[PDB]
Amino acid sequence: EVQLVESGGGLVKAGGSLILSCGVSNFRISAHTMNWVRRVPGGGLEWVASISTSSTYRDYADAVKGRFTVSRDDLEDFVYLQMHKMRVEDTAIYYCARKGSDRLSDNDPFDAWGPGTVVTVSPASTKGPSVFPLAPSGTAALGCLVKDYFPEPVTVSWNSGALTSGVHTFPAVLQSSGLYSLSSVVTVPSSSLGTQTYICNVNHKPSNTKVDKKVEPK
Amino acid sequence: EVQLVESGGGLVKAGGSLILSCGVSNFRISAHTMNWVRRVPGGGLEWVASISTSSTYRDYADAVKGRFTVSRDDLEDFVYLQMHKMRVEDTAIYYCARKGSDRLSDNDPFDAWGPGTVVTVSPASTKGPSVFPLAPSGTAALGCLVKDYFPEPVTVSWNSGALTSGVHTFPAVLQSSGLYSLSSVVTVPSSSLGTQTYICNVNHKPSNTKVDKKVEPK
Amino acid sequence: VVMTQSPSTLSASVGDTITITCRASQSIETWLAWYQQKPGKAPKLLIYKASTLKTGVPSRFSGSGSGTEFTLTISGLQFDDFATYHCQHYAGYSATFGQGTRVEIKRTVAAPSVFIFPPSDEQLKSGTASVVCLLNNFYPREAKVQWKVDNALQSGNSQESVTEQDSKDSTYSLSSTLTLSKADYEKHKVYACEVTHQGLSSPVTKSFNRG
Amino acid sequence: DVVMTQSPSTLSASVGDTITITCRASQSIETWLAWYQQKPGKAPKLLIYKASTLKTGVPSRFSGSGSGTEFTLTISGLQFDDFATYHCQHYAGYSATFGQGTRVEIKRTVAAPSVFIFPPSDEQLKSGTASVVCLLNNFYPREAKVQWKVDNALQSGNSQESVTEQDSKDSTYSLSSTLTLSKADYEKHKVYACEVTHQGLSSPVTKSFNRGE
Numbered sequence: 139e140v141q142l143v144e145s146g147g148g149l150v151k152a153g154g155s156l157i158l159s160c161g162v163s164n165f166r167i168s169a170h171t172m173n174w175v176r177r178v179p180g181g182g183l184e185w186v187a188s189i190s191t192s193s194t195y196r197d198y199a200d201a202v203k204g205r206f207t208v209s210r211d212d213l214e215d216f217v218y219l220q221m222h223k224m225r226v227e228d229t230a231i232y233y234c235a236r237k238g239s240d241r242l243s244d245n246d247p248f249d250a251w252g253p254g255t256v257v258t259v260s261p262a263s264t265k266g267p268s269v270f271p272l273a274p275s276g277t278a279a280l281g282c283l284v285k286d287y288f289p290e291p292v293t294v295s296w297n298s299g300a301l302t303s304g305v306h307t308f309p310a311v312l313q314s315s316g317l318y319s320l321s322s323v324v325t326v327p328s329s330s331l332g333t334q335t336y337i338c339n340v341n342h343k344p345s346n347t348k349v350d351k352k353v354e355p356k
Numbered sequence: 357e358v359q360l361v362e363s364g365g366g367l368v369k370a371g372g373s374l375i376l377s378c379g380v381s382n383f384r385i386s387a388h389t390m391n392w393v394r395r396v397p398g399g400g401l402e403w404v405a406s407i408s409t410s411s412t413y414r415d416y417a418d419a420v421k422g423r424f425t426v427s428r429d430d431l432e433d434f435v436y437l438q439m440h441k442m443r444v445e446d447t448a449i450y451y452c453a454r455k456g457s458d459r460l461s462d463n464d465p466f467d468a469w470g471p472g473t474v475v476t477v478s479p480a481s482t483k484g485p486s487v488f489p490l491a492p493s494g495t496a497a498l499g500c501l502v503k504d505y506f507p508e509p510v511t512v513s514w515n516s517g518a519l520t521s522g523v524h525t526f527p528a529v530l531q532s533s534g535l536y537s538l539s540s541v542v543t544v545p546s547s548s549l550g551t552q553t554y555i556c557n558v559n560h561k562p563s564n565t566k567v568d569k570k571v572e573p574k
Numbered sequence: 575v576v577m578t579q580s581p582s583t584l585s586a587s588v589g590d591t592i593t594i595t596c597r598a599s600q601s602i603e604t605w606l607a608w609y610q611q612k613p614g615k616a617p618k619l620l621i622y623k624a625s626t627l628k629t630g631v632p633s634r635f636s637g638s639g640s641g642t643e644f645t646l647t648i649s650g651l652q653f654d655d656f657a658t659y660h661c662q663h664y665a666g667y668s669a670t671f672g673q674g675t676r677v678e679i680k681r682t683v684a685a686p687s688v689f690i691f692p693p694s695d696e697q698l699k700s701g702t703a704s705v706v707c708l709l710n711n712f713y714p715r716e717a718k719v720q721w722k723v724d725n726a727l728q729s730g731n732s733q734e735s736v737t738e739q740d741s742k743d744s745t746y747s748l749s750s751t752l753t754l755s756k757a758d759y760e761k762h763k764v765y766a767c768e769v770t771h772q773g774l775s776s777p778v779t780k781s782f783n784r785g
Numbered sequence: 786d787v788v789m790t791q792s793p794s795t796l797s798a799s800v801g802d803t804i805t806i807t808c809r810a811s812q813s814i815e816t817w818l819a820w821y822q823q824k825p826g827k828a829p830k831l832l833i834y835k836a837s838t839l840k841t842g843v844p845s846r847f848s849g850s851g852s853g854t855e856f857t858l859t860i861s862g863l864q865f866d867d868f869a870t871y872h873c874q875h876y877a878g879y880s881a882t883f884g885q886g887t888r889v890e891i892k893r894t895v896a897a898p899s900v901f902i903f904p905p906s907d908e909q910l911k912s913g914t915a916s917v918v919c920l921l922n923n924f925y926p927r928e929a930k931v932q933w934k935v936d937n938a939l940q941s942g943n944s945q946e947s948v949t950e951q952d953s954k955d956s957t958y959s960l961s962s963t964l965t966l967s968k969a970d971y972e973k974h975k976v977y978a979c980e981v982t983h984q985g986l987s988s989p990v991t992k993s994f995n996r997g998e
């Protein structure tokens with residue numbers, strides 16, 4: 139029996155990119171126009187893209203034109219769908235489908251379909267950080283923890299840029315949650331912990347978030 | 357200047373699949389062998405895969421052979437890398453790189469590289485569910501909440517299969533965390549809440565997890 | 575070209591002869607196909623060029639029409655035929671679908687029995703509160719659940735799941751889970767789920783007070 | 786298969802120095818050898834190929850030599866822009882293979898890390914997550930090891946680390962390690978400690994705190 143199988147689905151943040159692929163069993167794709175179709179949550183089907191034999195014609199639904207790309211690999215029998223700038227309404231089950239019939243003509247229905255791969259686009263394309271103090275215990279260390287933001291980057295200054303000496307802002311780490319986190323620290327004279335106020339200025343331009351956190355002994 | 361740009365990186369669970377693509381600016385890929393290379397966390401580069409002009413040969417590193425596939429689309433100038441059965445040690449920055457030079461010769465270096473896309477493979481390929489009781493506050497309703505598991509499916513029975521009438525086990529939902537969650541409920545006579553014991557048997561074959569939870573009034 | 579199917583939901587009895595209609599915004603000759611699709615499965619081609627039955631498809635399926643008006647007829651519904659049906663205009667390099675028709679077993683209207691469950695202490699000690707609302711054995715399928723915390727309409731923090739038609743009584747059931755961190759859950763007192771459904775003359779609310 | 790090995794793995798030098806990086810092939814590769822520069826988070830850039838051909842536009846202080854199994858990249862007069870990783874590469878008709886990379890860094894004296902531990906802020910803890918932070922400040926060279934212990938129990942798998950580039954004024958490195966725990970798990974134990982080793986320390990350094998004190 140003819141078979142198709144999609145790979146590559148999953149969760150995507152709005153604005154992100156995801157690439158799907160389709161492989162086959164028991165036929166060769168080269169004689170067929172290949173298609174992507176999606177089943178939206180309301181239940182209906184939406185044609186997404188088509189690629190003719192020899193890739194002579196590539197066609198897209200109006201809703202994805204300029205964001206999606208379809209390619210074919212006739213020698214190892216794969217079809218690809220690049221999805222860029224993804225939107226909430228791209229959320230759907232994506233199928234690869236062969237255009238064909240028992241007897242090929244210039245315009246055939248979709249006679250063979252893969253089982254589908256789920257693609258889910260979350261609505262937030264950005265997220266501002268939470269900012270927590272790293273409280274100081276002759277030299278003391280203090281800082282700010284900038285946690286759970288997306289995407290990069292974040293900038294950190296101290297005392298609106300007046301405190302630069304001794305400052306280290308670390309590279310962000312990608313947490314297992316898919317959110318970024320970084321720390322910014324500074325060492326200062328221990329005697330100043332009583333008099334001087336220390337404020338870290340965290341700016342996250344993607345989410346248009348600014349946070350000023352005062353760090354003081356606990 | 358010639359340019360390349362990778363798309364499609366992100367977080368993947370071990371055993372999962374992810375597909376990358378590469379598009380270009382200011383040259384045509386058809387005259388070039390195209391390559392994928394990765395920079396591992398220790399800092400070194402590892403050649404991953406190549407595809408020759410006209411796709412005469414597709415070559416793979418020993419570590420990825422049988423799991424990765426490279427394809428080329430010479431008409432719209434894209435290269436693809438399918439990555440399947442992914443392993444923690446596939447975690448890296450992935451670059452597309454063309455074999456070429458100021459003057460193409462029989463054997464050239466990699467003269468143009470994309471900026472790279474980050475691919476992160478988490479070690480757990482499965483995760484067993486937490487099972488919480490849905491406590492019964494005529495006819496009463498009780499159940500079990502089977503939360504945070506991966507991948508599908510989970511099966512649920514009640515009282516080792518002796519209680520079937522009135523049982524509804526719902527389709528799982530994909531949570532924003534990427535973990536699945538489903539609830540199984542049953543309606544029963546309110547009079548039986550004092551004497552009859554109700555146990556939901558949750559089985560998660562992928563993680564070889566079995567849980568028997570007794571549901572009783574608060 | 576825009577394709578419009580009707581009805582959106584068709585309720586019928588086993589053995590019935592039913593028709594599904596598809597209308598095209600402009601003439602498409604006979605370039606029309608019909609697919610069946612079961613939940614979570616792939617579409618299956620039934621008929622193409624308006625009336626040609628795909629080999630192996632049972633003879634109780636048939637299609638007719640040309641130009642702008644097309645019909646799919648199922649002559650003697652069997653249990654296997656309850657499913658969604660899709661029409662499709664297909665051209666050489668593109669296609670477009672109608673919105674689909676869900677064919678279900680007809681029964682009398684049945685209002686949901688509503689139950690709300692607070693988070694278990696165990697889960698709550700881990701830092702997460704799952705509050706579950708259950709709509710049991712209702713018909714037809716359309717139901718609406720709204721969560722309110724201290725009379726505050728929630729939005730974006732719940733997920734729903736619905737069963738297929740029960741094999742014995744042809745009803746549906748629905749579970750809605752409102753998820754909140756232990757911290758946010760302890761910020762409010764009254765948790766309530768509000769249900770509307772064709773079988774309810776006014777909305778039904780089930781609630782509990784935290785603690 | 787051809788294996789390429791670079792020497793040294795980390796090369797420490799001063800601005801203006803002339804330095805050499807060596808690359809060795811496990812079998813003869815004629816002159817099919819290329820050298821790349823790469824800065825953190827950036828793409829590799831081709832410097833030299835066929836062992837000694839400078840890519841057009843690459844500054845003349847870079848040069849390469851060698852054939853067979855022994856190759857060298859020479860940088861004659863290091864500028865600040867040249868502190869980076871350098872990679873050698875054997876490239877053949879279908880595949881290529883790289884050395885392990887050589888990091889060229891600014892040389893300074895050995896400096897032991899100054900270690901600091903931070904408990905989670907009460908604010909974060911009330912949201913249900915506890916991030917415990919360990920700071921290793923201003924050490925050199927870059928290799929250091931940090932381990933977390935909770936109630937004297939060696940932890941495993943619940944921490945992430947990141948390291949700065951060489952400080953612009955004193956050329957040291959700094960490192961942060963974050964141990965992440967749910968509020969529930971965090972309130973289950975008392976003593977939180979990070980333990981540090983570094984060649985500049987004669988014995989491990991431990992910083993700890995007691996939850997709530």
Ligand SMILES: OC[C@H]1O[C@H](O[C@H]2[C@@H](O)[C@H](O)[C@@H](CO)O[C@@H]2O)[C@@H](O)[C@@H](O)[C@@H]1O
Nearest residue numbers: 169170171237238242243244245246666
């Ligand atoms: O999308 C049009 C058509 O494309 C594919 O068939 C092509 C070729 O392989 C066939 O031999 C001829 C027959 O007329 O048509 C095309 O050139 C198939 O996908 C076909 O089913 C489809 O209608």
Ligand SMILES: OC[C@H]1O[C@H](O)[C@@H](O)[C@@H](O)[C@@H]1O
Nearest residue numbers: 388389455456462463464878
């Ligand atoms: O692999 C041999 C040869 O293949 C292509 O022509 C290009 O990639 C060249 O740069 C390379 O030298």
